[PDB]
Design an enzyme around this catalytic site. Structure first.
Site, PDB file in Angstrom:
ATOM      1  CD  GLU A  23      14.780  14.213   0.230  1.00  0.00           C
ATOM      2  OE1 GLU A  23      14.522  13.956   1.428  1.00  0.00           O
ATOM      3  OE2 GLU A  23      15.894  14.638  -0.153  1.00  0.00           O
ATOM      4  CB  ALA A  97      19.693  24.872   7.588  1.00  0.00           C
ATOM      5  CG  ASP A 145       6.426  15.844  12.189  1.00  0.00           C
ATOM      6  OD1 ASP A 145       6.808  14.888  12.915  1.00  0.00           O
ATOM      7  OD2 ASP A 145       6.711  15.934  10.966  1.00  0.00           O
ATOM      8  NE  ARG A 149      10.166  13.217  11.514  1.00  0.00           N
ATOM      9  CZ  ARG A 149       9.881  12.585  12.650  1.00  0.00           C
ATOM     10  NH1 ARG A 149      10.825  11.911  13.299  1.00  0.00           N
ATOM     11  NH2 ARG A 149       8.656  12.631  13.153  1.00  0.00           N
ATOM     12  CG  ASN A 150      10.409  18.056  10.891  1.00  0.00           C
ATOM     13  OD1 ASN A 150      10.609  18.108   9.677  1.00  0.00           O
ATOM     14  ND2 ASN A 150       9.525  17.221  11.427  1.00  0.00           N
ATOM     15  CG  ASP A 163       8.739  21.122   7.244  1.00  0.00           C
ATOM     16  OD1 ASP A 163       9.247  22.037   6.536  1.00  0.00           O
ATOM     17  OD2 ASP A 163       8.517  19.962   6.817  1.00  0.00           O
TER      18      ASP A 163
END
Ligand SMILES: Cc1nc2ccc(-n3ncc(C(=O)c4cc5ccccc5[nH]4)c3N)cc2[nH]1
Length: 282
Positions: A23, A97, A145, A149-150, A163
């Site tokens: 997203e 992934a 970051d 989630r990353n 990221d």
């Protein structure tokens, strides 16, 4: 109007575009990605610009690709595979992934696949993230970051940092896709003084360690931005998760040292986690 780079260039017709993932990121199939195997397909992740793309959004995608070219390959990071820069919109081709981000992967495996992760699987997961970050740090790269989630998970359960090539205006009040505040992963010096280092990434890894051992638990649940700022200034630290050894909680606490110079390095975290993996039962 991008220059061609034959080291990474894939003809546009060799990429069969599929469903969206991120997203903007899409799942695709690449034909003959490897020159030695022209009749084989590889599932890949493709990053491209949106409809309302800015000239800065374009420059950032280019910078991200150029950064990925320089960093080099490692097993525990999302690696660059190729690019479509000619006769159409820019496509950045990276590793796919299949099992998605680490937070969901851990959530999906909480007690009531869905097959329970053993304590050796949890310590191994942290070791692989530490290894990815150790590689990025050695390449002089600061994530800024780092969070579950990353961290993306492959079909073979390999943890890969994602990221990391981002070019960074930071909104402290903006919540993630699942309604969580990213400021909860930031070192105090990065948060208050905007000083981002390998040491501030180590702090983020401590919060990631806490995420692993709570199986995708949310740090500081129900704590707003203003109150988090107060907790940090006071020297408040998260509690030990249930199903976490004193040694691994000491590791979390060391990652959260008030003094950045006193935190362990990713090199030290890799060696300590390598030893803990061997002493943990499956
Ligand atoms: C430095 C860098 N540049 C990048 C450019 C794109 C990506 N990127 N974004 C998403 C993915 C997936 O593999 C992926 C998403 C997803 C969602 C549900 C199920 C499976 C899934 N796999 C990926 N590899 C990471 C990047 N890291």
């Amino acid at each position: 109007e991008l220059p061609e780079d034959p080291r990474w260039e894939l003809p546009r017709d060799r990429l069969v575009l599929g469903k969206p993932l991120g997203e903007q990121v899409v799942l695709a199939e690449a034909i003959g990605l490897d020159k030695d195997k022209p009749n084989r397909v590889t599932k890949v992740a493709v990053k491209m610009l949106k409809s309302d793309a800015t000239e800065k959004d374009l420059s950032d995608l280019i910078s991200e690709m150029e950064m990925m070219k320089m960093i080099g390959k490692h097993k525990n990071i999302i690696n660059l595979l190729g690019a479509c820069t000619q006769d159409g919109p820019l496509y950045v081709i990276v590793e796919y992934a299949s099992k998605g981000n680490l937070r969901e992967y851990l959530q999906a495996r909480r007690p009531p696949p869905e097959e329970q992760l053993s304590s050796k699987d949890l310590v191994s997961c942290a070791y692989q993230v530490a290894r990815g970050m150790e590689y990025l740090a050695s390449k002089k790269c600061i994530h800024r970051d780092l969070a579950a989630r990353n961290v993306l998970v492959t079909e073979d359960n390999v943890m890969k940092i994602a990221d990391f090539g981002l070019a960074r205006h930071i909104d402290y009040y903006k919540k993630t896709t699942n309604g969580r505040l990213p400021v909860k992963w930031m070192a105090p010096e990065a948060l208050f003084d905007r000083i981002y280092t390998h040491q501030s990434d180590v702090w983020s890894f401590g919060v990631l360690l806490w995420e692993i051992f709570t199986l995708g638990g949310s740090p500081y649940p129900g704590v707003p931005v203003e109150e988090l700022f107060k907790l940090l200034k006071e020297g408040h630290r998260m509690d030990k998760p249930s199903n976490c050894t004193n040694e691994l909680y000491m590791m979390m606490r060391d990652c959260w040292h008030a003094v950045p110079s006193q935190r362990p390095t990713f090199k030290q975290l890799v060696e300590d986690l390598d030893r803990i993996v061997a002493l943990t039962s499956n």
